Amino acid sequence: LAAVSVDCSEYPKPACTMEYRPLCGSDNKTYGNKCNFCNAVVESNGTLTLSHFGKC
Amino acid sequence: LAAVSVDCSEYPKPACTMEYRPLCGSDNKTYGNKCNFCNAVVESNGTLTLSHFGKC
């Protein structure tokens, strides 16, 4: 429909610095920040997606 | 599928200024603007999403 999304295209970033803004993956883990989230979302291939913004 | 989305990643913004562009959350409330929407979308953890662009 409409949605509220994270863009992960220009990830993975080897080096990247990121207040504190966590995410909560499919997996029920709280991803520190977006660079933590979207890299693992590439190194996951499919078995990670965003269950929501914030901590779990 | 395809969708028309709002990116909330680099929220919450403590200070932020935002014409007038409302959103309409899951909850059937009209969120003044995007900074109003995406902060509450973090401080909601999951129980807020976008039902559509515009006022309700």
Short mmCIF file of C-alpha atoms in Angstrom, two decimals:
data_model
loop_
_atom_site.label_atom_id
_atom_site.label_comp_id
_atom_site.label_asym_id
_atom_site.label_seq_id
_atom_site.Cartn_x
_atom_site.Cartn_y
_atom_site.Cartn_z
CA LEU A 1 0.00 0.00 0.00
CA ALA A 2 1.77 2.99 1.49
CA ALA A 3 4.49 2.18 3.89
CA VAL A 4 7.16 3.60 6.13
CA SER A 5 10.48 2.34 4.89
CA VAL A 6 14.32 2.19 5.22
CA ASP A 7 16.46 2.48 2.10
CA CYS A 8 19.38 0.08 2.14
CA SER A 9 20.62 0.50 -1.40
CA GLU A 10 23.91 2.23 -0.83
CA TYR A 11 24.79 -0.32 1.87
CA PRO A 12 26.93 -2.19 2.89
CA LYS A 13 29.20 0.47 4.29
CA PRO A 14 32.48 -0.88 5.61
CA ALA A 15 33.18 2.25 7.51
CA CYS A 16 30.30 4.43 8.67
CA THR A 17 29.71 6.29 11.95
CA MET A 18 25.98 5.49 12.35
CA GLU A 19 21.74 10.66 18.76
CA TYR A 20 20.95 6.82 18.97
CA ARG A 21 18.28 5.48 16.54
CA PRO A 22 17.67 1.71 16.65
CA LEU A 23 15.75 -0.59 14.34
CA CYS A 24 14.08 -3.93 14.98
CA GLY A 25 14.62 -6.64 12.40
CA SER A 26 12.41 -9.60 11.51
CA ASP A 27 14.54 -11.58 13.88
CA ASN A 28 13.62 -9.67 17.01
CA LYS A 29 17.02 -8.08 17.43
CA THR A 30 17.54 -4.41 17.93
CA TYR A 31 19.86 -3.05 15.35
CA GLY A 32 21.88 -0.24 16.89
CA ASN A 33 21.45 2.10 13.96
CA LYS A 34 20.78 1.98 10.26
CA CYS A 35 24.30 1.08 9.22
CA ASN A 36 24.05 -1.79 11.59
CA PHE A 37 20.67 -2.76 10.10
CA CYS A 38 21.14 -2.41 6.35
CA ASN A 39 24.53 -4.16 6.23
CA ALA A 40 23.13 -7.16 7.98
CA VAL A 41 20.18 -6.89 5.64
CA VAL A 42 22.59 -7.47 2.75
CA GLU A 43 24.64 -10.09 4.48
CA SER A 44 21.37 -11.90 5.21
CA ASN A 45 19.94 -12.16 1.73
CA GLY A 46 16.27 -12.18 2.40
CA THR A 47 16.14 -13.62 5.88
CA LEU A 48 16.22 -10.16 7.40
CA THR A 49 13.69 -7.36 6.97
CA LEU A 50 12.38 -4.57 9.25
CA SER A 51 9.68 -5.52 11.71
CA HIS A 52 9.67 -1.91 12.88
CA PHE A 53 11.47 1.32 13.79
CA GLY A 54 12.71 1.49 17.36
CA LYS A 55 14.04 -1.13 19.79
CA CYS A 56 12.30 -4.43 20.29
CA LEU B 1 5.04 -4.92 -4.29
CA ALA B 2 5.82 -1.34 -5.22
CA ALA B 3 4.73 1.21 -2.73
CA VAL B 4 4.65 4.87 -1.89
CA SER B 5 6.57 5.35 1.31
CA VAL B 6 7.90 7.69 4.06
CA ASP B 7 11.45 7.24 5.32
CA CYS B 8 11.71 7.62 9.07
CA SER B 9 15.27 6.47 9.59
CA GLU B 10 16.93 9.68 10.62
CA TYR B 11 14.10 10.37 13.10
CA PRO B 12 13.44 11.16 15.93
CA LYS B 13 14.37 14.80 15.60
CA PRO B 14 14.18 16.71 18.85
CA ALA B 15 14.21 20.00 17.08
CA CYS B 16 12.92 20.24 13.53
CA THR B 17 10.77 22.88 11.80
CA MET B 18 8.51 20.51 9.80
CA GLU B 19 3.61 24.74 3.19
CA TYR B 20 1.54 22.25 5.42
CA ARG B 21 1.81 18.52 4.52
CA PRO B 22 -0.07 16.12 6.81
CA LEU B 23 0.04 12.36 7.13
CA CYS B 24 -2.55 9.89 8.39
CA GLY B 25 -1.33 7.16 10.71
CA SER B 26 -2.77 3.69 11.31
CA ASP B 27 -4.56 5.22 14.23
CA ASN B 28 -6.71 7.60 12.24
CA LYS B 29 -4.94 10.71 13.45
CA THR B 30 -3.64 13.37 11.16
CA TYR B 31 0.00 13.95 11.76
CA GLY B 32 0.77 17.61 11.14
CA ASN B 33 3.89 16.94 9.13
CA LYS B 34 6.54 14.29 8.72
CA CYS B 35 8.53 15.21 11.80
CA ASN B 36 5.35 14.86 13.72
CA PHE B 37 4.70 11.48 12.07
CA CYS B 38 8.07 9.72 12.11
CA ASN B 39 8.91 10.64 15.72
CA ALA B 40 5.69 9.18 16.93
CA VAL B 41 6.41 6.24 14.69
CA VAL B 42 9.55 5.60 16.74
CA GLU B 43 7.97 6.34 20.06
CA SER B 44 5.24 3.86 19.12
CA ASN B 45 7.33 0.83 18.29
CA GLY B 46 5.19 -0.91 15.77
CA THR B 47 1.76 0.26 16.75
CA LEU B 48 1.96 3.15 14.32
CA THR B 49 2.35 3.00 10.54
CA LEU B 50 1.07 5.15 7.64
CA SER B 51 -2.46 4.51 6.47
CA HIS B 52 -1.94 7.23 3.87
CA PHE B 53 -0.60 10.62 2.79
CA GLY B 54 -2.87 13.55 3.55
CA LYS B 55 -5.32 14.28 6.38
CA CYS B 56 -7.80 11.72 7.57
#
